[PDB]
XYZ file of C-alpha atoms in Angstrom:
116
model
C -6.165 8.085 -1.382
C -8.757 7.769 1.881
C -10.856 4.742 -0.182
C -11.329 0.830 0.807
C -9.072 -1.275 -1.052
C -7.562 0.180 -4.274
C -9.310 -0.611 -7.490
C -6.649 -2.768 -9.303
C -9.535 -4.622 -11.346
C -9.227 -2.481 -14.188
C -5.540 -3.128 -14.061
C -6.357 -7.038 -14.036
C -9.091 -6.602 -17.457
C -6.338 -5.328 -19.887
C -3.502 -7.372 -18.253
C -1.767 -10.124 -20.918
C -1.050 -13.634 -20.551
C 1.544 -15.699 -22.281
C 2.932 -19.037 -23.082
C -0.616 -21.842 -21.699
C -1.777 -19.802 -18.781
C -4.874 -17.630 -17.846
C -6.042 -15.706 -14.962
C -7.955 -18.379 -13.585
C -4.188 -20.031 -13.466
C -2.643 -20.580 -9.843
C 0.147 -18.469 -10.652
C -2.128 -15.425 -12.328
C -4.919 -15.996 -9.330
C -2.296 -16.154 -6.599
C -0.380 -13.498 -8.227
C -2.922 -11.251 -8.281
C -4.116 -11.569 -4.639
C -0.616 -11.054 -3.322
C -0.303 -7.488 -5.293
C -3.977 -6.775 -4.256
C -3.435 -7.960 -0.905
C -0.356 -5.556 -0.063
C -0.394 -2.297 1.603
C -1.074 0.688 -0.639
C 2.521 1.843 -0.728
C 3.657 -1.599 -1.252
C 1.721 -1.268 -4.413
C 3.284 2.209 -6.074
C 6.596 0.570 -5.771
C 5.348 -2.445 -7.365
C 3.818 -0.908 -9.929
C 6.838 1.394 -10.423
C 9.108 -2.051 -10.634
C 6.884 -3.304 -13.917
C 5.841 -0.533 -15.620
C 7.707 2.152 -13.778
C 4.791 4.007 -12.778
C 3.011 4.925 -9.485
C -0.117 3.398 -7.831
C -3.454 3.112 -9.172
C -4.700 6.521 -9.980
C -8.306 7.786 -9.278
C -8.681 6.684 -12.684
C -8.755 3.235 -14.375
C -5.612 1.464 -14.479
C -7.123 -0.424 -18.046
C -6.172 2.604 -20.234
C -2.335 1.065 -19.846
C -1.400 -2.635 -20.961
C 0.604 -5.090 -18.774
C 2.256 -8.020 -20.104
C 2.681 -11.289 -17.808
C 4.786 -13.706 -19.097
C 6.526 -17.207 -17.382
C 9.993 -17.346 -16.905
C 9.761 -21.090 -16.291
C 8.969 -24.450 -14.244
C 8.509 -23.944 -10.284
C 12.236 -23.049 -9.313
C 13.954 -20.214 -7.158
C 14.984 -17.440 -9.780
C 14.973 -13.895 -9.156
C 12.163 -12.271 -11.063
C 12.608 -9.229 -13.589
C 10.308 -6.914 -15.367
C 11.077 -4.177 -17.743
C 9.606 -0.753 -16.935
C 10.268 0.345 -20.702
C 7.825 -2.598 -22.707
C 5.432 -3.361 -19.326
C 6.463 -6.764 -19.446
C 6.309 -9.262 -15.997
C 8.990 -12.352 -16.068
C 8.124 -14.401 -13.288
C 8.050 -18.501 -13.148
C 5.780 -20.619 -12.182
C 5.976 -20.763 -8.506
C 3.947 -23.855 -6.852
C 3.126 -21.370 -3.232
C 1.888 -17.769 -3.030
C 3.947 -17.334 -0.209
C 7.056 -18.872 -2.708
C 6.178 -16.115 -5.575
C 5.343 -13.410 -2.738
C 8.886 -13.788 -1.156
C 10.799 -13.627 -3.890
C 8.532 -10.786 -5.847
C 8.736 -8.585 -2.975
C 12.279 -8.867 -2.324
C 12.869 -8.072 -6.599
C 10.648 -4.936 -6.736
C 11.925 -3.387 -3.263
C 15.564 -4.030 -4.658
C 15.044 -2.394 -7.782
C 14.674 1.177 -7.793
C 11.312 2.594 -8.852
C 10.921 5.122 -12.174
C 9.721 7.921 -9.712
C 9.663 11.154 -10.886
C 10.937 14.762 -11.091
């Protein structure tokens, strides 16, 4: 909708972390920059892949629970997620580009839940 940058912060507020990492961590922190920095259409397909839903609605995203899990050490693997359980499985990459490229392809390749 006509606005300056989508309010994905609410989503971040309820976003969960696994293993031994947090939001301040390079993996999550860099990850968030990529999602927020993406265009509106990119965000829409991004959310469908991870949780089977559309980009940030006029309301807050904090109403939905998001789960972040680390696949493993910095290695080249295709990112995976489940809309049914709203879980994101991404390996801990050493660079935002490294995870951005793998992540972007995974969400674009996969078909979003959509509607109707």
